[PDB]
RNA sequence: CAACGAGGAAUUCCUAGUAAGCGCAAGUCAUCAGCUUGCGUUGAUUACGUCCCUGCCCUUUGUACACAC
């Protein structure tokens, strides 16, 4: 078993293990996680 | 510090001590033979004798005493 | 949010479990575990592990899924082990086995616990340089 | 010291629907960042010549002389 | 170059903002665009136009639109005006000397409310980005930033230091503890947006999208989580649109309270709230017919405690309001509407009857405006100015005073001109009508009904003025002469297409007409000769201009570019792309080939006709610039726009290892300082209590970052990286190793941050003593010996404590899996079928190998 | 009654058969004899570390399969 992505859609699950919920993330971390996902797509 | 004219005293490794020893002795013999009656062999003999007994009349150990004294100063 | 601010980790835990806010759940479990190490059969405070003892099947299957993907770290694994331990010692083992879905989780997190057991056991193994240094320091006279 | 490319990007950020400002800025950075069409000596106590321009006028002069002959 | 600048701006009285009222009825501070103007309601003369000290158009004016004022707010007693603008900045002025005292940028979008609090020295500001910031005025500092809303702050209400309560452009109302600056209680007020908020101390009132107005009871001294603010019932209004400002008063002389809800459209609903005596004596009357049903009826309160009142209407759409009161028969309410006009109404009320079928306005300040956008501007020789509107408000302003001295009523009028002697105005309207006015006498010299079959679009005089040209959307142009002061239609040229601009040359030579069919045609006036057809603009084509030498024409259009044409052969010269929306108008200078073009994207632009540069990019308007007009001689140019504005333009580094070393030295210095303090306390409590140490004050950086020294050292030990950790621990000498051991010895007494950093403490400590083992076992001190023993016991106890539950969980989880297996795995006794079953049911993973 | 007794400020290059000294031949379709290219003879001093300065470059999911981090 390895930590993939979330089986929901209001959730963000990093491969670290730290599952974050989109309703609980503030807008700063929403923008930051969106840019980080853009980096991991762009590579 | 970008060129702040301050010196800091370091120690010096034994290979550098032997390198700078041979350099000080030989170029002291050269400048001591530069335009005097004596040749390089006789000036080097005088230099090696005075450096062996440590007489402070040699270029080499006067230069050593200056380097060590400046290190003692801005230690 | 008010419970997470003012303290009060048990009702914060059950609200984070009801809302399914997993980072907040990790924070309430980590904070309550750390204050449990601070103060002084019971591993969290008693109100919170009773609140873990009284949750139903789908709640404990999402709790053990959270414990599953926290156990893949070597950092966030202690919180997962304390939560797994209180589930194991506060629930019925026949119930835990016959819940549909509780073998694709516990088979996922047996080998990670074995990996951590090997690592912490080697930490205890190389913790005896202190004992060797003490026997040298006593031989010093 | 620092690169000609780094100084060129700095010069473009310096200079930044007008046209003649861009004509002036482009001609300025071209004749500044082209160093191989001047000649520089070393002052022993400095642009000392313009080789390509002197060459082209010296050869256009004899070109029109040759066509005249 | 002799550049341009802005002399004065006018034409606006009330713009896209609120209004504050000041007592002497009284005066009124309101917004013009980017500057605030004060008016006395009594007469209405402009007694102040407080503006920025820099003229827009100067050398240091920056290359964007100026910040439109969006919220006025006033501190009455200490005489301040806090005004806030559309970029987010807040300027606080003293109204005595009219200078800027405070600049308070802070925000990221336009701001929506201000409020002074504790009457002086504190200002709270809410903006179109969802933050709400508290500012001190004695420190010039944003104190706090309350940050949990989602869309845009629509209102708030604060009391001093403890409770704020805001409501935003999502559906949410929030209550804020201003001591901790964390939001305490959040509700969904209305299902769409939430536009209103007012409160008289017991009841709170909010409104949302459509007529549903919600009463709330805030109980500030509550202790439950949900229940500091509860909802007590809804009611209805007569307007189905956004009620967007609610405000309360307590009239004296008995004690009574009134609140209004202004609406989007045209209407303010006023309400009297009643008093507790008629609450008590009205409860029984709806509690008649005598109790579960009666309790449901008594619960279903709003119409009970609130009483509607005289619903004040207006002619136009309502933008802001505020009132004053005496006697409860002088509810005197000032009102700024959208089409620029303020109105001072006042409703009387004899404490039972409102004494009127409809309220009455006592004043109206509307003379210096237009109520619509000025579709055509014009100028005299140099003295007067002509503004043409849609309601009919032709106005003849003057340049030297900026006051309309003469105004008439025409209709939907889009183009106009003067007459060459002055004191006479020709004009065409959007239906088939033309009109003539003057300056000394009354409005109408004559109108010409059926001047055209359809919408007129552009007219032009000849340079002597006796003959004018009218081109209209009935696909015709017509010529008119002046017979003696009446209009003589004599000839008419019908085209194939809707002509929408005309012009003649300034020397009676050419007639250039711009058709809807993407082209212009140049005719000879003396022959109707069809000289030229200029083509290739590619959208329908607006304003033309002919130069003074009658050699060079300009051609503007909705293609966002103006074309320069040489009129001798009809050859194009430039096609320069300006103005990213649409160039509405373009005009030469008097004597030069320089020209101006004003456009539909709130900018006028100054060009030359020789190098075709842009000389200047003037940036003072806020919206679509509909017209501009140049002086006949001298060359100052006026421009008039959609924001009801008319404005003049005239001429002028350690690393890891040493970071850990300095952290270790200050941390262990603080630690043994406190331990010496504790030994002093025990000795001065176990001996003759006559003396002790005075005080060890804690470290500057430790109280600055709010950390115990173990935490400070622990996070810098965390912040070094794993690649240079074995170097950071190898650089430090043995004295720092000994105080590192003191740090570890103290940190495994606080068992919270021991267990959260166990493998880091183990890795660092074991590398440290493994590297320094030769010197450590040669140190002779029983203090360090007891230290090593104590660290050993606590560290190994923590590690065996975590692997105890690790081993417990291994055996328990494999018991759970194994009892599930022996419950319902399968039935194979034969070993070959068993092993093939397990091979088919195993976990597969596919790997990329190399052969 | 002119220059000059190892050449100022600055500046460039250089790590083992290398720097430098020394002579002897050739003259190879371009180049070179106001010299160029070969060939041997003699043959060191000091770095061989470091990113502290000056710069240039690379990466910022570990992916590639375990173990470990």
Swiss-Prot record, chain A:
Protein's cellular compartments: Nucleus, Nucleolus
Signal peptide residue numbers: none
Source superkingdom: Eukaryota
Subunit description: Component of a heterotrimeric complex containing IMP3, IMP4 and MPP10. Interacts with snoRNA U3. Component of the ribosomal small subunit (SSU) processome composed of at least 40 protein subunits and snoRNA U3. Interacts with the SSU processome subunits EMG1, IMP3, IMP4, KRR1, NOC4/UTP19, NOP1, RPS4A, RPS4B, RPS6A, RPS6B, RPS7A, RPS7B, RPS9A, RPS9B, RPS14A, RPS14B, UTP1-UTP18, UTP20-UTP22 and UTP25.
Family indicated by similarity: Belongs to the MPP10 family.
Entry function: Involved in nucleolar processing of pre-18S ribosomal RNA. Required for the early cleavages at sites A0, A1 and A2 during 18S ribosomal pre-RNA processing.
Protein name: U3 small nucleolar RNA-associated protein MPP10
Biological source species: Saccharomyces cerevisiae (strain ATCC 204508 / S288c)
Full protein: residues contained: 496 to 538 of 593
UniProtKB/Swiss-Prot annotation, chain C:
WD-type repeats, residues: 1-36
Subcellular location per the Swiss-Prot or TrEMBL entry: Nucleus, Nucleolus
Further remark: Present with 8070 molecules/cell in log phase SD medium.
Subunit annotation: Interacts with snoRNA U3. Interacts with MPP10. Component of the ribosomal small subunit (SSU) processome composed of at least 40 protein subunits and snoRNA U3.
Purpose: Involved in nucleolar processing of pre-18S ribosomal RNA.
Protein name: U3 small nucleolar RNA-associated protein 13
Source organism (scientific name): Saccharomyces cerevisiae (strain ATCC 204508 / S288c) (Baker's yeast)
Record lineage: Eukaryota, Fungi, Dikarya, Ascomycota, Saccharomycotina
Gene name as annotated: UTP13
Curated annotation (Swiss-Prot), chain D:
Record's subcellular location: Nucleus, Nucleolus
Ranges of biased composition (kind: Basic and acidic residues): 17-22
Location of the region described as Disordered in the Swiss-Prot/TrEMBL record: 41-62
Record function comment: Involved in nucleolar processing of pre-18S ribosomal RNA. Has a role in the nuclear export of 40S pre-ribosomal subunit to the cytoplasm.
Family: Belongs to the NOP14 family.
Subunit structure: Interacts with snoRNA U3. Interacts with EMG1, MPP10 and NOC4. Component of the ribosomal small subunit (SSU) processome composed of at least 40 protein subunits and snoRNA U3.
Protein name, as recorded: Nucleolar complex protein 14
Organism: Saccharomyces cerevisiae (strain ATCC 204508 / S288c)
UniProtKB/Swiss-Prot annotation, chain E:
Coiled coil (UniProt feature): none
Localization of this protein: Nucleus, Nucleolus
Gene3D superfamilies found in the cross-reference section: YVTN repeat-like/Quinoprotein amine dehydrogenase
Molecular functions per Gene Ontology: snoRNA binding; U3 snoRNA binding
Gene Ontology CC: one annotated term: 90S preribosome
PANTHER family given in the database record: WD REPEAT CONTAINING PROTEIN 3 WDR3, WD REPEAT-CONTAINING PROTEIN 3
Function per UniProt: Involved in nucleolar processing of pre-18S ribosomal RNA.
Stated family: Belongs to the WD repeat WDR3/UTP12 family.
Subunit structure, as described in the record: Interacts with snoRNA U3. Interacts with MPP10. Component of the ribosomal small subunit (SSU) processome composed of at least 40 protein subunits and snoRNA U3.
Protein name, entry field: U3 small nucleolar RNA-associated protein 12
UniProt source species: Saccharomyces cerevisiae (strain ATCC 204508 / S288c)
